[PDB]
Amino acid sequence: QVLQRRTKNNPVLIGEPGVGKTAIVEGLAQRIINGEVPEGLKGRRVLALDMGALVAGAKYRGEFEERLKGVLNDLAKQEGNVILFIDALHTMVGAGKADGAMDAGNMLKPALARGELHCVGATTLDEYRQYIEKDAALERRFQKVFVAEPSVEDTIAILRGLKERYELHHHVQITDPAIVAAATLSHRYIA
Amino acid sequence: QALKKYTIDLTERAEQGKLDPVIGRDEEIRRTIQVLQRRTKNNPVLIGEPGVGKTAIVEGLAQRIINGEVPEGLKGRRVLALDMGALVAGAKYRGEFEERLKGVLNDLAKQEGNVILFIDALHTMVGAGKADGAMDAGNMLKPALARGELHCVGATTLDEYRQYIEKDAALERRFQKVFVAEPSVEDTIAILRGLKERYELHHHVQITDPAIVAAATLSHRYIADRQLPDKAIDLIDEAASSIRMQIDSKPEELDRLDRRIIQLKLEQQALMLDMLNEELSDKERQYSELEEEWKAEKLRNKVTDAEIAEVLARWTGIPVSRMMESEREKLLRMEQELHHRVIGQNEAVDAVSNAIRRSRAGLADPNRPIGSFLFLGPTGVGKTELCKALANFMFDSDEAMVRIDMSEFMEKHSVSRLVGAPPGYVGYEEGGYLTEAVRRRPYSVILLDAVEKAHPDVFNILLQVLDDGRLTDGQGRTVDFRNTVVIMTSNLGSDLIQERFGELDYAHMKELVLGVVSHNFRPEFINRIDEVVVFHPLGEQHIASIAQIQLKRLYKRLEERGYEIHISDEALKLLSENGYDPVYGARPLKRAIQQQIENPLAQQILSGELVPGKVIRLEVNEDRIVAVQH
Amino acid sequence: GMDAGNMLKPALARGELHCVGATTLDEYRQYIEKDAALERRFQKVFVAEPSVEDTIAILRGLKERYELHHHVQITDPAIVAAATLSHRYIADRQLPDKAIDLIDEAASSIRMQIDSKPEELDRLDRRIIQLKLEQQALMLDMLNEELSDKERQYSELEEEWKAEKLRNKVTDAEIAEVLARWTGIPVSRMMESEREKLLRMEQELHHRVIGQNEAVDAVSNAIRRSRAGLADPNRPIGSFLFLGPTGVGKTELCKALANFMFDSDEAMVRIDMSEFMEKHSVSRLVGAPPGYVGYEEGGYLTEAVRRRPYSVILLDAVEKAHPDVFNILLQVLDDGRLTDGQGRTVDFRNTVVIMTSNLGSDLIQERFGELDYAHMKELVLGVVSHNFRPEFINRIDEVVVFHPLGEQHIASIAQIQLKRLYKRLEERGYEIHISDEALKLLSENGYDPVYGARPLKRAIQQQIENPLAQQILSGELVPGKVIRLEVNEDRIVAVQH
Numbered sequence A: 001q002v003l004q005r006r007t008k009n010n011p012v013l014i015g016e017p018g019v020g021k022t023a024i025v026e027g028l029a030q031r032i033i034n035g036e037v038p039e040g041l042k043g044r045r046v047l048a049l050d051m052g053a054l055v056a057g058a059k060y061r062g063e064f065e066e067r068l069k070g071v072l073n074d075l076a077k078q079e080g081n082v083i084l085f086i087d088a089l090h091t092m093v094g095a096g097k098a099d100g101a102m103d104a105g106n107m108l109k110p111a112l113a114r115g116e117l118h119c120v121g122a123t124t125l126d127e128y129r130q131y132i133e134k135d136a137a138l139e140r141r142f143q144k145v146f147v148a149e150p151s152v153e154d155t156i157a158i159l160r161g162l163k164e165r166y167e168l169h170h171h172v173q174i175t176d177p178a179i180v181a182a183a184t185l186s187h188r189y190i191a
Numbered sequence B: 001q002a003l004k005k006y007t008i009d010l011t012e013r014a015e016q017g018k019l020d021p022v023i024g025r026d027e028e029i030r031r032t033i034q035v036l037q038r039r040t041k042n043n044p045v046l047i048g049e050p051g052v053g054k055t056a057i058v059e060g061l062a063q064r065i066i067n068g069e070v071p072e073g074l075k076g077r078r079v080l081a082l083d084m085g086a087l088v089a090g091a092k093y094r095g096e097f098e099e100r101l102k103g104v105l106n107d108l109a110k111q112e113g114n115v116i117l118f119i120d121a122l123h124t125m126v127g128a129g130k131a132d133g134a135m136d137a138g139n140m141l142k143p144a145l146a147r148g149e150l151h152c153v154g155a156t157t158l159d160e161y162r163q164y165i166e167k168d169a170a171l172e173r174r175f176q177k178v179f180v181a182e183p184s185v186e187d188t189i190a191i192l193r194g195l196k197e198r199y200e201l202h203h204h205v206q207i208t209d210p211a212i213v214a215a216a217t218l219s220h221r222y223i224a225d226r227q228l229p230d231k232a233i234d235l236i237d238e239a240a241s242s243i244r245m246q247i248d249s250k251p252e253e254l255d256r257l258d259r260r261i262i263q264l265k266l267e268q269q270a271l272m273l274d275m276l277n278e279e280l281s282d283k284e285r286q287y288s289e290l291e292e293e294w295k296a297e298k299l300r301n302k303v304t305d306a307e308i309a310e311v312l313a314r315w316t317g318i319p320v321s322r323m324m325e326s327e328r329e330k331l332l333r334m335e336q337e338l339h340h341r342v343i344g345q346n347e348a349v350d351a352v353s354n355a356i357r358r359s360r361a362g363l364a365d366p367n368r369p370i371g372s373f374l375f376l377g378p379t380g381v382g383k384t385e386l387c388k389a390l391a392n393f394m395f396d397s398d399e400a401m402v403r404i405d406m407s408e409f410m411e412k413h414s415v416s417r418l419v420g421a422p423p424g425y426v427g428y429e430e431g432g433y434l435t436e437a438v439r440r441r442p443y444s445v446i447l448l449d450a451v452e453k454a455h456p457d458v459f460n461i462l463l464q465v466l467d468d469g470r471l472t473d474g475q476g477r478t479v480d481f482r483n484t485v486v487i488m489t490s491n492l493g494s495d496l497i498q499e500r501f502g503e504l505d506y507a508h509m510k511e512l513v514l515g516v517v518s519h520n521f522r523p524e525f526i527n528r529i530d531e532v533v534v535f536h537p538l539g540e541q542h543i544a545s546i547a548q549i550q551l552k553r554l555y556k557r558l559e560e561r562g563y564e565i566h567i568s569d570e571a572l573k574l575l576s577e578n579g580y581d582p583v584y585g586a587r588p589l590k591r592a593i594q595q596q597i598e599n600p601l602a603q604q605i606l607s608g609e610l611v612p613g614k615v616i617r618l619e620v621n622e623d624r625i626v627a628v629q630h
Numbered sequence C: 001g002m003d004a005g006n007m008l009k010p011a012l013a014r015g016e017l018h019c020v021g022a023t024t025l026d027e028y029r030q031y032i033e034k035d036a037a038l039e040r041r042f043q044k045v046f047v048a049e050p051s052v053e054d055t056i057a058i059l060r061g062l063k064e065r066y067e068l069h070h071h072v073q074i075t076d077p078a079i080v081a082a083a084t085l086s087h088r089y090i091a092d093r094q095l096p097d098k099a100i101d102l103i104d105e106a107a108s109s110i111r112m113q114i115d116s117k118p119e120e121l122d123r124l125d126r127r128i129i130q131l132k133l134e135q136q137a138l139m140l141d142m143l144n145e146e147l148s149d150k151e152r153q154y155s156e157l158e159e160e161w162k163a164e165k166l167r168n169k170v171t172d173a174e175i176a177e178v179l180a181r182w183t184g185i186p187v188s189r190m191m192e193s194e195r196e197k198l199l200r201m202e203q204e205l206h207h208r209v210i211g212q213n214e215a216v217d218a219v220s221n222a223i224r225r226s227r228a229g230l231a232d233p234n235r236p237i238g239s240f241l242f243l244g245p246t247g248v249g250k251t252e253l254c255k256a257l258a259n260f261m262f263d264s265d266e267a268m269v270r271i272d273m274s275e276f277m278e279k280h281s282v283s284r285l286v287g288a289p290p291g292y293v294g295y296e297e298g299g300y301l302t303e304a305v306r307r308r309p310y311s312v313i314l315l316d317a318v319e320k321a322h323p324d325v326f327n328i329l330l331q332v333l334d335d336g337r338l339t340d341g342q343g344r345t346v347d348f349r350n351t352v353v354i355m356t357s358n359l360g361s362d363l364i365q366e367r368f369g370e371l372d373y374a375h376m377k378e379l380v381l382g383v384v385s386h387n388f389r390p391e392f393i394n395r396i397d398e399v400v401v402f403h404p405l406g407e408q409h410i411a412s413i414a415q416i417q418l419k420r421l422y423k424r425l426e427e428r429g430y431e432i433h434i435s436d437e438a439l440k441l442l443s444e445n446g447y448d449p450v451y452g453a454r455p456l457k458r459a460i461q462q463q464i465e466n467p468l469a470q471q472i473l474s475g476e477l478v479p480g481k482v483i484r485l486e487v488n489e490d491r492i493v494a495v496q497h
Ligand SMILES: Nc1ncnc2c1ncn2[C@@H]1O[C@H](COP(=O)(O)OP(=O)(O)OP(O)(O)=S)[C@@H](O)[C@H]1O
Pocket: A016, A017, A018, A019, A020, A021, A022, A023, A024, A123, A124, A158, A162
C-alpha cells in the first residue's frame, strides 16, 4: 500500500533485530514472482542497492555523485518499474559524506519526496533513532512499517515452513515436537 | 551551454502542468517577491520545519510567474532550480568544479537579470566541492550574492540551517530568512481540497470531503513526529492506495482469510494433536460466506473518513478505527472478560472498563491521558493482576506494557533514569526509559507499581504527565502521553481497609483512605488522578475462585508436559480452607497450592511412579492431598 | 592548491606586493592565525560596527541610491526609524547592513503596491479566489456567508481604491512593517481589527478563564504596555509569578494567552519545571559547554526563543525545581539576555515569562475571606520570600494571587466543559441538550474548595461520559436525535426523544 502512492513511495521496515525485516522484502519479491500481488505490481523488479559498491572506488571529487546520479537516471529510465531496496537505510544516511561531498541522503532526498523512487528501506528501531531521526527531512521522506516480533504460534508456523530447507542442508529430519520445543523454549529462556 | 546542463527550468514544468497546485501561502509568496526585487541581497531563504511547504512556495512562485499572477517586474522571469549534485557530480579534476560554477554564473549574468536561481537544500552549498582547491561553492557565489546580481531563492530547513549555514556567518548575511510556518488545521483542509483532484486522478478513486477534513483533524491530533500538510496528504494518499488495491484484486477480509487458509494449508502439510483442521474448516466456511456476500454486493470504492481512520490506526498504532462488530461485542463484555483473571474487585474493573469505553466511544478528553488511576488496598488482592489483565485484554499479551517498578526509585536521581540525562552527561544519547518507550508505541498501558516505595518528589514528572499528557526528555523532544493509561498501584491504606471494610459502604471508605493518601501525597498530584479505586480484602468465596484459576493454569502447565489431572471436590475445599487468611490476600493460597500439590506431585513425577496418560486424581487423606494412579 | 600562501609569503614581507585583504573576524582566527608567518605578513586593520548615527549618515547617501533604483521616495524619518528599529529588534545581524535591508525591502514593498494594487486588495483577492475554489470543491458549507462577506469587503475596498484614483513614499510605518515580517514582533502600527481585538483583551480571556480578575488585568496591562510603545526596552515584556491553590486557572491563563496572541495553545515555550529537580537540568535548558556531548544541539530555551523572539515562556510549577535554575532566570528576567553553551546571547526582551506555582495554597485557602487583595498578596509574598531569594523576586514584574473557585465560578466552568463535550459529540455526529437540574447536579457534585475545578471535570467525566459511552457503544443511541440529559432521583440519564 505504501509503494503504490503518488508521492513518498518509501516504506521503511522498522523493528528489533531478528524479527524478519529483510525477510519481508524477500517475501515481497517472491510474491511478485509468483503473481500473488495486485495487478499494479505484477512484473516489478526488486533491486537491492549496494552502498558499499557505490562508495567503494570513488576517491576523486565527484565520483560517488556520478555513480549515484547514473543509478538515479537508470531508474528513471525504467519508467517506474523498479522497486528499489536499501537495507540498513542508515548506511544510506551517511554514505558518500566526504569533505564537502554530496552524500547519498542529500542526493536521494529530492527523488524520494517526489515519489519517483520506490525505495523500500529496512532499519533497526535503534539505528533509526541514532542515524535517521538525526536528519528530519530524510526522516520524513519514509513511511514507517513497524515489524513486531512474532508470537510463539507464528514462530511455529515459520519453523514448519523453513524446516524442509534445514533438512535439505543438514541431511537430517526435524520433527514437529522439536519445532514447538524450539519456539517455546527459546521464547521462555533466551533473553 | 552551462545553464541547460546544471539547472531544471521550473517555469517550464509549471507551463507543462507538471507541478502540483499550490494553495494559500499568500504572505510567504508575497514576501519572497519583495525580497527578490531588491537591489542588493536579492536572496530569500525559506526556513521552516520539514514538511511545512517550502518547496511548494517556490513551485507556487513559478506557477504565478507562468499565469501572470505576479507584479510587472516578474512577468517573464525564469525559475531555474540549481542542482548542486550534478555540478559536483562530474567534476573529477582540479579546477573542473570552479570552472562549471563560474560558467553558470556567467550565463546567469548574460540573462540581463531575467532568471530566479533556486537552490533547495541550500545547506548543501556551504562546502560543495571543497578540496585542496577549497573554493567551496559558497565562497564563489558570495560576491554575486553580496551585490544582488543573483536572485537565488534558497529553501533550507530550520535545524539544517543552524548546523550548516550559521557556522559560516559570512554567507548567513547574504540571505533573508523568510519563515514558513506550519499551516493550521483549517488551512490544511483548504489545501487538501485543491490537491484532491490530482490524487484522485492518480489513484482512480474519489476522495470524499469528510475524508479531507478528517485527515487534517486526525493527523493533527494523533501524529506528533510530522507536520501539516504532509501527514494529512500521507493519510489521504495511502488510503487511496488501499482502496485502489481493494478494487484491483479483492477486499480486506477476503485477503485475510485467503492468506490464512493458504497458511494453514501449508501448516497442515507440515503436520504430515492437530486442532488445526478445525481452524482451517472454520476459516474456509467463513471465507465461503464472505465470498457469497461479495458476490451479492457485485463494497469500498470511495475514500471516506473510515479509510483515513484505518490508515491512521495502522500508521500510529492507536485504535481510531470504527469498531467492527466482533471487537465491539468483545468490548461490551470488557468487565466479563476481566473477571476471568481478576475475581472480585468490582469497582476497579468497572473503572478500567469505563475508561476504555470512553476512549473507544470518542468521548475522552483529548488534552489528558486516557485513564489515570490509583489502585489502593491490601497485599495480594489483584492490583497488579488488574494491570496485567488490562495489558492482556488490550494487547493479547500479559507483559506487553510499559512497566515501571517504583521501588527502584527511592532516591531523587531516578527522575533522570526515566527522562534521561541532560546535555553534557553520560546517558545523554541513550534517552530515557519512559519517554523512549511511550514514544515507540504511543497507545500503551503504563504501570507504576508500588507507588509508595518511591521518593515523594518523583511524582512531579507525573504532574506534567497526568495533567497534559506531555513529558520532555533530556534531548528536548516532548513525548505525547495522550493515548496511554497510567496506573499507580499502592497500599497506602491497607491497615485501615483491613480494619474497617466491615460496616462501611464504598464511599466512606474512599473518603477515609483518600484522607490517608492526602497525608502521603500532595494536593497537586491527587488532583490529576482520574479515579482512585480502593480494593477490598478477599473472602472465602474469592479464594475458592482464585484456587480454581490457579489450578487451571497448573493443569495447563502439566498437560503440555503430558499429564492429565483431575481433582476431588473435597481437595479443592482443603486448598480453599488452608490458603485463607485476611491479611495476605491470595498469595497464601498460591504457596499452599505449591506445597500441598506440587511438592508431592513433583516428588512422584521424578520418581517414575506416575506414568503419563493415566488420569492423575488428587484425592484427600485425613489431612493430606495424595495423588493416585488408576 | 607551496600552493597559494607560501608563494606569496616571501613576496609580502618585502613590501613588493600591496595586498589589501579583507576577511572576517572569525575567518582570520580559523584560517590565518593558524599559520603564524602568514599571520605576521599582514597588518590588522579593525573595522568596527558603526553606531546608530553613523548608520543614519550611511543611509542618507544610500537613500539617494536606492530611490534612484526602486523609483520610490524614502522619507528621512524612515531612515532614522530603520536605524533605530534594526538596532533594537534584529539581533542576528549588524549595522549598517540590516538597516539597508529594511530600507530596500520597504522600497520593494512600496514599488509592488504602486505596481499591481495595494496590500488589502491583494489579501482579499487571494482569499476570495481561494474560497471560490474551495466552494467549487464543496460541490454544511458555512462558507457562503464568509465568501459573501469577503466579496462585499473587496468590492468596498475596490470602490475606495477607485475613489483615491495610497502609498508611494517610504515612511517609518513601512519600515516597521518590514521589521514585523522579518522578525515576528508586532512593531507595526495598530490597524482597526487588531486594536479592537486588543481593547477586548480582558473580555476575550474570560471566555476561557472565568473568575481570576487580577491576573487577567495584569496580563492585559502588560501587553497593552507593549503595543503602545511604553515597555521598558531593556527587560522582557512581562515577567509574572502565578500563585494560588490547584485548579484555579494558572496554566489556563497561560494557555489563554498563547491562544489569544498566537491562535494556538501549543504555541508557547512550555518548560515543565518539575523536570529540573537537579543541578544539571540547567544544562538541559542552556546547553552543553564546548567539548561535551550535547554541544551541537544547542539549548532548549535559547533555541526556542532565538527562532521566534516574540513568544510566551511558560515555567510550570516552578517551586518543584532546584534553585540554580532560578539563577539562570535571574539573568533572563533582569536584562533579557541568556548566553547558551555555544556562546551566543539570545535576546529575551520581546517575551512574556510566566511562572506558575502554588506556594501559598493553604494560606490562600484559609484566609481569602476576611482579607482584601493587598494583605493577601503581602502574606503570600512573605511565603514566596521564604522559598525564593531576594534577588529573584525582585526581578518579578508582578506577583498575582489566584483565588479559589466558588459556586458561580464552577457553574460557569461547567458550562465551558459541557460546550467542549458538545463539540466532541457533534464532531462524532450526536447532539445533546442538558437539563438545568442536571447542570445543578454537576455543579453540586463537583464543588469542593481544596481542589479547585478538576473535581468538576471528573464529575462530568463520570456522571455523563461513562454511561454515555456505555450507551453509544451499545447501539442504544442513534445518530440524528437529540440526547436529553435528564435526571433520575440522583443520576443523570440519557434518553432518545
Ligand atoms: N516470516 C519469516 N518467514 C520465514 N523466515 C523468516 C521470517 N522472518 C524471519 N525469517 C528468518 O529469520 C532469519 C533472520 O531474519 P532477518 O530478516 O534476516 O533478520 P533481520 O530482520 O534482517 O534483522 P537484522 O537487522 O538484519 S539483524 C533468517 O533466517 C530469515 O529467513
